[PDB]
């Protein structure tokens, strides 16, 4: 019935835009075929729609954002229920729309999203690799379009007047390349040199101009914080990671998010995390910083406001460094090698942070 | 001094043949740049050579085989020592030369081989994916050529009259695609449907026209068989897997190879395994078969000769099926689901096999 719900796309346009040659510079355009269904998979689609946009900036107008706005205005016209949405999209999301869609999914317990992509946009770029990881951690099921998905998108969204889908040569080969790329980037862990150069707690003198943050989530069960090995992650920033964790899909109760950040939060980040833990009493926040970041501004007030709003803030010591090496680093069986003076630098930084957070004088 | 030992290749030829676009149908030819060094990495190369061939059949004349023959006659002209060999090869090995090189490496403790490949040949084909796995398990270090390796092969094997290497557009993007593909196929495990459709022990009535074999290796340490989790594997057939395990790389002394095969060995395979365990007293062989394969010929004599030569032969029961599901299958956390009548079919097959192996009558 999708054929009657949408204005189908020209066959030329489909063959041109959903060709899955990994590298294709010349295709300015993104096409997003979406179908909306109830949670019952047997049921037919309630609605479907084709969105289009350009890949280049003003991502406000990218088909993903158009979908979000349309869907928000669509759900208000039907009774509240649970939805399964499927996308066939010719390019995978940019970084901005990965963040947007991921926060939408993480805050909405009634939506499930499966994204089949024909090609990976900027698959070579660490920012977009991270963006896809963020999408997947928010709960979106990311997949490369295979022959079956191209066939189904032909049958449902393309004006292929009875004519069946005929594949181009190398469709499966492209699928193999792209699916391997997506899998490895989804399972990717931090490079060891990245880790040791960014989490070293000796006084800065080169690099380290970016912030790295690893995080784990635990849930309350029986007066006992029990971990969730499936909801870990690490992010690089050179709006607030708590907005990307789906506190709803997890075992229903209260949670403790433990954070390991190479630099202590900037002012903005501190205020965003404080606002989050204020409006989410079921989430406790623990922050471990490798170094204290002094922005010459209000960073002290930022940390103090974060602390007032319930976050526990400490400096990383050997235990936390070793945990992050063992959990978030592509270590290759090799053990954590502490650098010289780790514990002493950690104790001094702890004293500094103690002075920063202290309210009453003795 | 690799620009004095070899007849360097034309720059045109290098850029044409080492372009790393994954799909390149038109390149008939394989180029293999090899350098031979002592175990000391600081030391300069003792020798170097450029081999060429065609990708298409008569693999006797592929550059890998020409290297093997050249190297065999080269080692006889120098004192016995340990060698580190490096290849820069424009296409990765075919299946036949993967087998040849892998058995050469598995039988020779004094050679180390690193293969950098510009492109993956038939990366989409399960036979070639398995071939690369076989190479890696024999000990070859398989890697995709990156910018640094292209620069090296330019500097060492190409007549680039002082001119430096200048990369083509998309070299890193291609590297990302190819390296992800190589990693995924190197870590690939058996599809769940493949496993249960091929290892089901109820009487044949469809499919199962191929043999699947999973294997683990253990080493003797203080009268206690201790496993080697890094030397497992699984193979599909439509010469003998024992010739591909490097019984020299492992912690020395004696070993026990445990085999789980969907069909019991054909006559040929039984005789090859028997010949192997005869000429390798430090290796014990245990075989577990899911079904008994009756080739209308001498299969009974094959199993009896394998048993006479010291191999332990049994039929798989629940324990072995569950172990293979847990070890060699991409199960995704899902537990082994035994089919109905598994244990009873296993007991009947065990009775049949007992009758086959019985020598003295009671
Ligand atoms: Zn976008
Ligand atoms: Zn070959």
XYZ file of C-alpha atoms and ligand atoms in Angstrom:
726
model
C 0.000 0.000 0.000
C 3.007 2.244 0.262
C 2.619 2.807 -3.481
C -0.685 4.624 -2.817
C 0.548 6.650 0.188
C 3.535 8.360 -1.451
C 4.338 10.211 -4.635
C 6.809 7.614 -5.950
C 10.204 8.593 -7.295
C 11.304 8.369 -10.911
C 13.119 5.081 -11.717
C 16.041 7.025 -13.199
C 16.333 8.935 -9.914
C 16.285 5.717 -7.879
C 18.944 3.940 -9.947
C 21.092 7.077 -9.922
C 20.817 7.826 -6.198
C 20.764 4.347 -4.624
C 23.693 2.957 -6.601
C 25.940 1.670 -3.823
C 29.408 2.374 -5.204
C 31.129 3.377 -1.922
C 32.873 6.468 -3.363
C 30.501 8.663 -5.410
C 31.455 12.357 -5.468
C 28.870 14.105 -7.601
C 25.768 12.922 -5.740
C 24.839 16.113 -3.897
C 21.454 14.679 -2.956
C 20.012 12.515 -0.175
C 16.789 10.541 -0.595
C 15.014 9.101 2.459
C 12.183 6.601 1.960
C 10.411 6.039 5.268
C 7.565 3.780 6.317
C 5.738 3.898 9.659
C 4.199 0.764 11.177
C 2.685 -0.355 14.450
C 4.660 -2.654 16.745
C 2.880 -5.625 15.144
C 5.133 -6.577 12.188
C 2.287 -8.411 10.427
C 0.331 -5.161 10.145
C 0.589 -3.033 7.013
C 2.166 0.441 7.099
C 0.084 3.225 8.599
C 1.861 5.797 6.419
C 4.931 6.343 4.269
C 6.793 9.296 2.840
C 9.722 10.224 0.607
C 11.981 13.095 1.694
C 14.823 14.681 -0.248
C 17.606 17.109 0.503
C 21.186 18.051 -0.244
C 24.209 16.760 1.659
C 25.808 20.184 2.070
C 25.309 22.578 5.011
C 22.194 23.946 6.673
C 21.523 20.386 7.893
C 18.290 21.866 9.265
C 16.934 20.962 5.807
C 18.402 17.459 5.557
C 15.801 14.709 4.975
C 16.386 13.337 8.487
C 15.315 16.622 10.076
C 12.378 16.932 7.631
C 11.337 13.451 8.801
C 11.643 14.415 12.460
C 9.431 17.488 11.977
C 6.875 15.643 9.827
C 6.760 12.698 12.263
C 6.312 15.007 15.260
C 3.342 16.682 13.506
C 2.062 13.242 12.364
C 2.015 11.529 15.776
C -0.231 14.274 17.163
C -2.911 13.218 14.648
C -3.094 9.578 15.785
C -3.687 7.896 19.127
C -0.593 7.307 21.238
C 0.993 3.940 20.467
C 4.355 2.330 19.748
C 5.869 2.758 16.291
C 8.396 0.893 14.151
C 9.920 3.202 11.521
C 12.049 1.997 8.617
C 14.311 4.228 6.512
C 15.920 3.428 3.187
C 18.335 6.340 2.807
C 20.815 6.848 -0.026
C 23.509 8.460 2.158
C 23.919 7.706 5.856
C 23.395 10.638 8.275
C 25.710 13.606 8.739
C 27.068 14.254 12.240
C 24.427 16.851 13.160
C 21.471 14.670 12.141
C 23.010 11.630 13.761
C 23.028 13.638 16.997
C 19.473 14.909 16.446
C 18.013 11.487 15.619
C 19.960 9.836 18.436
C 18.680 12.235 21.094
C 15.152 11.848 19.702
C 15.451 8.069 20.037
C 17.083 8.194 23.476
C 14.305 10.370 24.912
C 11.341 8.608 23.242
C 10.498 5.089 24.502
C 7.719 4.525 21.937
C 9.737 4.753 18.686
C 11.965 2.085 17.118
C 14.058 3.072 14.095
C 15.798 0.869 11.524
C 18.043 2.696 9.042
C 19.149 0.891 5.887
C 21.722 2.993 4.022
C 22.820 2.575 0.416
C 26.201 4.266 0.941
C 28.175 5.407 3.978
C 28.684 9.180 3.952
C 32.262 10.137 4.914
C 32.968 6.607 6.176
C 36.678 7.527 6.295
C 36.074 10.416 8.696
C 36.356 9.815 12.467
C 33.575 12.333 13.168
C 31.070 10.430 11.020
C 32.242 7.054 12.351
C 31.531 8.360 15.845
C 28.186 9.730 14.605
C 27.106 6.270 13.456
C 28.217 4.829 16.804
C 26.085 7.455 18.568
C 23.081 6.528 16.428
C 23.538 2.830 17.220
C 23.962 3.424 20.955
C 20.776 5.501 21.046
C 19.092 2.350 19.691
C 18.852 2.880 15.923
C 19.482 -0.348 14.011
C 22.032 0.639 11.360
C 22.446 -1.621 8.330
C 23.747 -1.512 4.774
C 21.100 -1.946 2.093
C 21.443 -5.353 0.436
C 19.764 -6.724 -2.688
C 16.577 -7.501 -0.739
C 16.322 -3.939 0.592
C 16.941 -2.413 -2.841
C 14.246 -4.723 -4.229
C 11.809 -3.697 -1.487
C 12.522 0.018 -1.909
C 11.951 -0.393 -5.643
C 8.638 -2.170 -5.024
C 7.387 0.307 -2.418
C 8.720 3.769 -3.342
C 9.615 3.644 -7.063
C 7.308 4.027 -10.072
C 8.555 0.795 -11.597
C 5.333 0.170 -13.577
C 5.213 -3.557 -12.812
C 8.803 -3.975 -14.006
C 10.859 -5.766 -11.314
C 14.070 -4.516 -9.744
C 17.146 -5.416 -11.779
C 20.447 -5.025 -9.904
C 23.503 -3.270 -11.231
C 26.725 -5.220 -11.545
C 28.765 -5.247 -8.291
C 25.821 -4.555 -5.940
C 26.846 -7.493 -3.671
C 30.560 -6.582 -3.788
C 29.745 -3.024 -2.727
C 27.511 -4.425 0.012
C 30.390 -6.543 1.330
C 32.767 -3.564 1.424
C 30.206 -1.269 3.074
C 28.896 -3.793 5.607
C 32.414 -4.674 6.731
C 33.194 -0.958 7.083
C 30.037 -0.329 9.129
C 30.672 -3.327 11.379
C 34.276 -2.452 12.158
C 33.498 1.215 12.773
C 30.607 0.220 15.052
C 32.867 -2.072 17.100
C 35.845 0.311 16.941
C 37.717 1.003 20.183
C 40.166 3.765 21.038
C 43.669 3.645 19.589
C 46.255 2.965 22.344
C 48.330 6.014 21.429
C 45.185 8.144 21.452
C 44.433 6.894 24.967
C 47.869 7.339 26.505
C 48.441 10.736 24.887
C 45.034 12.074 25.931
C 44.573 10.602 29.429
C 48.117 11.212 30.695
C 47.823 13.336 33.843
C 51.182 15.080 33.707
C 51.202 18.860 33.160
C 50.213 19.747 29.594
C 52.881 20.898 27.136
C 51.725 19.533 23.789
C 48.620 18.305 21.994
C 45.643 17.298 24.142
C 43.561 20.066 22.532
C 40.573 17.694 22.485
C 38.459 16.116 25.205
C 37.908 12.367 25.309
C 35.145 10.834 27.395
C 34.403 7.184 28.111
C 31.272 6.157 29.966
C 29.536 3.150 31.482
C 25.975 2.773 32.762
C 24.743 0.685 35.692
C 21.202 -0.002 36.846
C 19.755 -0.412 40.315
C 18.715 -3.996 41.104
C 18.259 -5.154 44.708
C 20.179 -2.317 46.414
C 23.020 -3.241 44.022
C 24.475 -1.312 41.057
C 24.662 -3.978 38.333
C 26.520 -3.103 35.107
C 25.165 -3.115 31.557
C 28.063 -4.280 29.375
C 26.037 -3.387 26.257
C 25.717 0.376 26.937
C 29.314 1.579 27.193
C 30.902 4.143 24.920
C 33.546 6.746 24.218
C 33.229 10.139 22.531
C 35.644 12.769 21.261
C 34.910 16.514 21.405
C 37.540 18.892 20.093
C 25.203 18.687 23.323
C 26.138 16.605 26.401
C 26.509 12.821 26.174
C 23.790 12.140 28.762
C 21.241 13.198 26.114
C 22.317 10.257 23.923
C 21.926 7.348 26.390
C 18.419 5.796 26.202
C 17.412 5.793 29.874
C 14.238 3.877 28.991
C 15.365 0.822 27.023
C 17.607 -0.208 29.925
C 16.342 -2.296 32.845
C 13.661 -0.008 34.275
C 14.623 1.789 37.504
C 17.396 4.210 38.455
C 20.852 4.408 36.932
C 24.409 5.453 37.676
C 26.399 6.832 34.742
C 30.143 6.796 35.366
C 32.172 9.204 33.247
C 35.925 9.218 32.546
C 36.956 12.432 30.794
C 40.476 13.482 29.825
C 39.633 17.110 30.665
C 37.230 18.157 33.397
C 34.024 19.682 31.951
C 34.109 23.110 30.364
C 31.619 25.579 31.830
C 28.984 24.904 29.143
C 29.304 21.123 29.526
C 29.134 21.360 33.316
C 25.934 23.412 33.113
C 24.378 21.052 30.556
C 25.151 17.968 32.663
C 23.826 19.734 35.765
C 20.605 20.664 33.967
C 20.296 17.033 32.858
C 20.770 15.486 36.294
C 18.362 18.066 37.722
C 15.544 17.043 35.349
C 16.342 13.303 35.648
C 16.352 12.249 39.303
C 16.537 8.580 38.266
C 20.084 9.170 36.922
C 23.130 9.634 39.156
C 26.324 11.023 37.642
C 29.900 10.196 38.648
C 32.704 12.080 36.888
C 36.385 11.102 36.886
C 38.737 13.576 35.204
C 42.337 12.918 34.218
C 43.255 16.624 34.232
C 41.609 19.844 35.409
C 40.735 22.178 32.527
C 41.106 25.881 33.384
C 39.394 28.048 30.758
C 40.418 31.293 32.539
C 36.695 31.805 33.135
C 33.901 30.210 35.169
C 35.085 26.575 35.142
C 35.268 26.549 38.953
C 31.654 27.712 39.201
C 30.755 25.094 36.597
C 32.243 22.268 38.650
C 30.682 23.633 41.843
C 27.229 23.852 40.231
C 27.638 20.313 38.875
C 28.530 19.179 42.404
C 25.611 21.046 44.004
C 23.193 19.320 41.610
C 24.341 15.898 42.856
C 27.180 14.836 40.562
C 30.158 13.174 42.210
C 33.411 14.570 40.818
C 36.866 13.091 41.343
C 40.225 12.839 39.607
C 41.230 9.649 37.830
C 43.825 7.520 39.620
C 45.438 4.198 38.672
C 42.202 2.222 39.074
C 40.210 4.373 36.644
C 43.041 4.603 34.097
C 43.411 0.819 34.143
C 39.654 0.309 33.835
C 39.522 2.575 30.783
C 42.517 0.859 29.192
C 40.837 -2.510 29.759
C 37.377 -1.414 28.566
C 37.555 1.297 25.880
C 41.002 0.792 24.290
C 41.984 -1.539 21.436
C 44.750 -2.855 23.669
C 45.259 -6.231 21.901
C 45.637 -8.285 25.072
C 48.454 -6.005 26.248
C 48.133 -4.748 29.834
C 47.869 -1.206 31.133
C 51.326 0.339 31.534
C 51.182 3.116 34.156
C 53.420 6.074 33.445
C 55.908 7.423 35.965
C 54.410 9.581 38.706
C 50.813 8.667 37.823
C 49.618 8.285 41.417
C 51.424 11.386 42.684
C 50.104 13.640 39.915
C 46.654 12.175 40.572
C 46.897 12.994 44.284
C 47.991 16.577 43.592
C 45.185 17.080 41.059
C 42.792 15.629 43.647
C 43.979 18.254 46.120
C 43.428 21.022 43.565
C 39.923 19.744 42.794
C 39.173 19.460 46.516
C 40.104 23.131 46.864
C 37.902 24.022 43.880
C 34.826 22.197 45.216
C 35.234 23.236 48.868
C 32.371 25.436 50.085
C 32.843 25.922 53.833
C 36.251 26.904 55.130
C 37.831 25.154 58.094
C 69.732 -1.069 -1.124
C 66.579 -2.443 -2.882
C 67.227 -0.061 -5.847
C 70.361 -2.070 -6.851
C 69.258 -5.687 -6.271
C 66.203 -5.677 -8.558
C 65.260 -4.626 -12.055
C 62.831 -1.869 -11.009
C 59.385 -1.568 -12.538
C 58.186 1.234 -14.788
C 56.356 4.027 -12.884
C 53.348 3.778 -15.216
C 53.144 0.064 -14.403
C 53.308 0.746 -10.661
C 50.565 3.383 -10.587
C 48.427 1.239 -12.896
C 48.788 -2.015 -10.951
C 48.909 -0.797 -7.333
C 45.934 1.554 -7.585
C 43.799 0.335 -4.693
C 40.269 0.822 -6.013
C 38.652 -2.301 -4.480
C 36.852 -3.301 -7.704
C 39.144 -3.183 -10.760
C 38.058 -5.656 -13.441
C 40.568 -5.247 -16.238
C 43.750 -5.867 -14.229
C 44.822 -9.266 -15.567
C 48.171 -9.119 -13.815
C 49.695 -9.623 -10.365
C 52.926 -7.932 -9.298
C 54.764 -9.197 -6.208
C 57.581 -7.084 -4.766
C 59.480 -9.130 -2.188
C 62.373 -8.340 0.120
C 64.304 -10.857 2.232
C 65.896 -9.846 5.537
C 67.524 -11.492 8.524
C 65.736 -11.665 11.873
C 67.410 -8.357 12.789
C 65.029 -5.614 11.554
C 67.822 -3.016 11.633
C 69.835 -5.018 9.100
C 69.535 -4.189 5.412
C 67.879 -6.614 2.980
C 69.964 -9.563 1.859
C 68.070 -9.706 -1.438
C 64.944 -8.512 -3.202
C 63.014 -9.469 -6.300
C 60.019 -8.512 -8.426
C 57.779 -11.308 -9.722
C 54.860 -10.966 -12.126
C 52.073 -13.182 -13.367
C 48.469 -13.383 -14.483
C 45.529 -13.856 -12.137
C 43.879 -16.492 -14.327
C 44.442 -20.275 -14.168
C 47.586 -22.387 -14.239
C 48.303 -20.981 -10.757
C 51.605 -22.868 -11.015
C 52.836 -19.648 -12.670
C 51.396 -17.123 -10.208
C 54.031 -14.831 -8.633
C 53.538 -16.493 -5.225
C 54.600 -19.875 -6.600
C 57.484 -18.319 -8.519
C 58.592 -16.749 -5.243
C 58.367 -20.097 -3.467
C 60.535 -21.797 -6.113
C 63.055 -18.936 -6.261
C 63.264 -18.764 -2.452
C 63.757 -22.521 -2.160
C 66.743 -22.386 -4.478
C 67.968 -19.137 -2.872
C 68.094 -20.497 0.685
C 70.359 -23.338 -0.480
C 73.011 -20.762 -1.465
C 73.250 -19.109 1.967
C 73.959 -20.405 5.451
C 70.916 -21.609 7.361
C 69.351 -18.784 9.360
C 65.997 -17.196 10.150
C 64.374 -14.958 7.549
C 61.802 -12.167 7.585
C 60.181 -11.844 4.150
C 57.997 -8.906 3.131
C 55.638 -8.852 0.135
C 53.961 -5.888 -1.503
C 51.515 -7.608 -3.849
C 48.947 -5.879 -6.051
C 46.288 -8.614 -5.719
C 45.965 -10.843 -2.666
C 46.533 -14.589 -3.218
C 44.141 -16.932 -4.985
C 42.966 -20.012 -3.068
C 45.597 -22.405 -4.461
C 48.507 -20.098 -3.642
C 47.060 -19.339 -0.234
C 47.155 -23.082 0.446
C 50.683 -23.489 -0.941
C 52.128 -20.536 0.984
C 50.268 -21.523 4.153
C 51.578 -25.095 4.158
C 55.081 -23.790 3.409
C 54.834 -21.474 6.422
C 53.273 -24.095 8.704
C 56.062 -26.592 8.004
C 58.994 -24.128 8.093
C 59.931 -22.636 11.498
C 62.673 -20.362 10.094
C 60.600 -18.099 7.782
C 58.409 -15.125 8.707
C 56.126 -13.623 6.062
C 54.307 -10.289 6.009
C 52.007 -9.763 3.023
C 50.876 -6.224 2.274
C 48.219 -6.280 -0.453
C 47.013 -3.361 -2.550
C 43.647 -4.958 -3.352
C 41.729 -7.986 -2.103
C 41.169 -10.506 -4.901
C 37.600 -11.886 -4.865
C 36.994 -10.434 -1.396
C 33.277 -11.214 -1.872
C 33.890 -14.935 -2.409
C 33.735 -17.296 0.604
C 36.495 -19.486 -0.864
C 38.950 -16.576 -0.982
C 37.868 -15.270 2.433
C 38.653 -18.724 3.813
C 41.944 -18.698 1.874
C 43.019 -15.492 3.613
C 42.035 -17.004 6.967
C 44.177 -20.054 6.163
C 47.147 -17.827 5.324
C 46.739 -15.933 8.602
C 46.405 -19.111 10.673
C 49.582 -20.523 9.135
C 51.243 -17.385 10.549
C 51.390 -14.972 7.605
C 50.759 -11.383 8.678
C 48.124 -10.130 6.225
C 47.677 -6.372 5.879
C 46.274 -3.825 3.443
C 48.840 -1.512 1.870
C 48.499 2.010 3.275
C 50.110 5.264 2.141
C 53.349 4.382 3.954
C 53.602 1.005 2.217
C 52.876 2.491 -1.210
C 55.590 5.073 -0.499
C 57.999 2.253 0.472
C 57.289 0.156 -2.569
C 57.759 3.230 -4.748
C 61.098 4.031 -3.096
C 62.404 0.457 -3.190
C 61.028 -1.218 -6.342
C 60.033 1.578 -8.763
C 62.240 3.527 -11.182
C 60.987 6.835 -9.824
C 64.140 8.788 -10.790
C 64.344 10.745 -7.531
C 60.711 11.795 -7.923
C 58.766 11.089 -4.700
C 55.595 9.040 -4.430
C 52.478 11.107 -5.057
C 49.223 9.447 -3.964
C 46.118 9.200 -6.087
C 42.895 10.710 -4.825
C 40.953 8.311 -2.548
C 43.941 6.130 -1.545
C 43.023 6.419 2.186
C 39.294 5.863 1.552
C 40.062 2.680 -0.384
C 42.416 1.624 2.409
C 39.620 2.036 4.964
C 37.191 -0.049 2.892
C 39.758 -2.804 2.252
C 41.158 -2.949 5.793
C 37.676 -3.218 7.284
C 36.861 -6.002 4.810
C 40.073 -7.889 5.634
C 39.515 -7.558 9.382
C 35.918 -8.748 9.223
C 36.715 -11.738 7.027
C 39.678 -12.637 9.252
C 37.448 -12.656 12.348
C 34.436 -14.188 10.569
C 32.641 -17.048 12.324
C 30.202 -19.584 10.918
C 26.671 -18.453 10.125
C 24.162 -20.026 12.569
C 22.009 -21.431 9.774
C 25.092 -22.887 8.091
C 26.043 -24.577 11.370
C 22.726 -26.193 12.249
C 21.965 -27.117 8.630
C 25.356 -28.800 8.196
C 25.914 -30.397 11.624
C 22.402 -31.813 12.113
C 22.808 -35.559 12.695
C 19.442 -36.778 11.470
C 19.324 -38.911 8.302
C 20.218 -36.904 5.197
C 17.458 -35.876 2.788
C 18.542 -32.481 1.483
C 21.602 -30.287 1.037
C 24.676 -31.108 3.131
C 26.695 -31.772 -0.048
C 29.713 -30.053 1.546
C 31.933 -30.929 4.497
C 32.491 -28.502 7.366
C 35.312 -28.971 9.853
C 36.105 -27.019 13.011
C 39.294 -27.658 14.948
C 41.106 -26.725 18.143
C 44.710 -27.347 19.192
C 46.044 -28.080 22.679
C 49.615 -28.416 23.922
C 51.114 -30.721 26.536
C 52.243 -28.978 29.737
C 53.036 -31.138 32.790
C 50.791 -34.023 31.645
C 47.859 -31.620 31.201
C 46.421 -30.673 27.807
C 46.257 -26.861 27.921
C 44.337 -25.109 25.120
C 45.605 -22.502 22.660
C 42.600 -20.229 22.107
C 44.460 -18.398 19.314
C 44.884 -21.410 16.990
C 41.303 -22.536 16.342
C 39.586 -22.581 12.973
C 36.860 -23.842 10.689
C 37.098 -24.897 7.043
C 34.646 -25.741 4.278
C 35.326 -28.299 1.543
C 33.185 -29.430 -1.388
C 45.125 -31.344 1.124
C 44.241 -32.102 4.769
C 43.866 -29.343 7.366
C 46.677 -30.725 9.544
C 49.137 -29.464 6.898
C 48.018 -25.876 7.597
C 48.530 -25.734 11.386
C 52.013 -24.422 12.316
C 53.163 -27.119 14.748
C 56.328 -25.130 15.481
C 54.940 -21.730 16.371
C 53.065 -23.087 19.353
C 54.534 -23.735 22.774
C 56.641 -26.767 21.922
C 56.621 -30.537 22.603
C 53.448 -32.456 21.700
C 49.947 -31.416 20.683
C 46.402 -32.739 20.490
C 44.306 -31.576 17.532
C 40.582 -32.061 18.092
C 38.446 -32.144 14.953
C 34.671 -31.678 14.583
C 33.551 -32.581 11.063
C 30.000 -32.607 9.718
C 30.827 -35.664 7.587
C 33.295 -38.339 8.631
C 36.453 -38.284 6.463
C 36.251 -39.467 2.888
C 38.793 -42.138 1.956
C 41.299 -39.649 0.509
C 41.091 -37.425 3.600
C 41.368 -40.396 5.962
C 44.540 -41.563 4.210
C 46.058 -38.073 4.206
C 45.370 -37.575 7.923
C 46.748 -41.048 8.669
C 49.917 -40.315 6.696
C 50.236 -37.034 8.604
C 49.854 -38.510 12.086
C 52.275 -41.260 11.053
C 55.040 -38.785 10.126
C 54.318 -36.494 13.119
C 54.421 -38.476 16.364
C 54.237 -35.227 18.361
C 50.647 -34.658 17.128
C 47.637 -36.632 18.366
C 44.401 -36.545 16.379
C 40.869 -36.787 17.779
C 37.974 -36.789 15.307
C 34.308 -36.172 16.124
C 31.908 -36.627 13.206
C 28.306 -35.455 13.073
C 27.333 -38.010 10.410
C 28.989 -41.039 8.819
C 29.760 -40.471 5.135
C 29.352 -43.596 2.981
C 31.038 -42.976 -0.390
C 29.993 -46.402 -1.788
C 33.694 -47.288 -1.746
C 36.513 -47.761 0.760
C 35.411 -45.290 3.461
C 35.308 -48.067 6.078
C 38.910 -49.022 5.316
C 39.780 -45.325 5.458
C 38.379 -44.945 8.965
C 40.011 -48.199 10.072
C 43.418 -47.124 8.723
C 43.032 -43.736 10.430
C 42.218 -45.568 13.675
C 45.132 -48.002 13.299
C 47.510 -45.040 12.920
C 46.456 -43.654 16.321
C 43.560 -41.289 15.626
C 40.631 -41.307 18.029
C 37.356 -41.350 16.094
C 33.929 -40.794 17.631
C 30.535 -39.371 16.733
C 29.518 -35.922 17.930
C 26.991 -35.842 20.773
C 25.396 -32.929 22.648
C 28.673 -31.868 24.283
C 30.557 -31.489 20.997
C 27.654 -29.781 19.208
C 27.325 -27.264 22.041
C 31.079 -26.663 22.112
C 31.105 -25.993 18.369
C 28.128 -23.647 18.625
C 29.850 -21.765 21.452
C 33.269 -21.606 19.762
C 32.999 -21.462 15.956
C 29.525 -19.972 15.347
C 28.474 -16.313 15.167
C 25.761 -17.100 17.692
C 25.394 -13.528 19.067
C 24.939 -14.540 22.703
C 22.195 -16.985 21.775
C 22.591 -20.426 23.392
C 22.855 -23.770 21.641
C 19.398 -25.106 20.762
C 19.549 -28.917 20.535
C 17.226 -30.438 17.973
C 14.823 -33.252 18.786
C 16.380 -36.706 18.951
C 19.953 -35.378 18.887
C 21.246 -37.742 21.576
C 19.441 -40.797 20.198
C 20.659 -40.266 16.629
C 24.144 -39.712 18.052
C 23.987 -43.002 19.968
C 22.833 -44.934 16.892
C 25.565 -43.374 14.742
C 28.059 -44.271 17.484
C 26.891 -47.878 17.277
C 27.340 -47.862 13.496
C 30.838 -46.377 13.817
C 31.718 -48.935 16.494
C 30.708 -51.669 14.050
C 32.830 -50.041 11.333
C 35.963 -49.787 13.498
C 35.632 -53.187 15.204
C 38.487 -55.552 14.334
C 38.124 -58.630 16.545
C 34.745 -60.290 16.794
C 33.247 -61.305 20.116
Zn 22.347 15.689 7.995
Zn 47.560 -17.793 -7.126
